[PDB]
Amino acid sequence: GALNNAGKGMIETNIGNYIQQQINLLEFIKMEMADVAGISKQREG
Amino acid sequence: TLQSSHITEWLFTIHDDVKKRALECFLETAKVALKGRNKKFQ
Numbered sequence A: 001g002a003l004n005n006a007g008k009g010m011i012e013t014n015i016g017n018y019i020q021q022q023i024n025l026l027e028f029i030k031m032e033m034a035d036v037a038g039i040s041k042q043r044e045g
Numbered sequence B: 001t002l003q004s005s006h007i008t009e010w011l012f013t014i015h016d017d018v019k020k021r022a023l024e025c026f027l028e029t030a031k032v033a034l035k036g037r038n039k040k041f042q
Helices: A016-037 B002-034
Strands: none
Touching: none
């Protein structure tokens, strides 16, 4: 009876969470470079 | 906005130097044109 039921399947990959993780890491690394250089974000603008 | 103006002040500084030199080059050109029988300079 699953042939008249069970809905439609999805080839879903959770690549958005990976992308968000990479973006957050980029923000963290840029922040840490800013701090070590002694040049804050508020001090660039 | 001043702290951001610092980021581009180098472009502006080299631009200002180029402008000073171009005006000196124009001044020497005009000096040489003076001795060319042109009544505009009168």
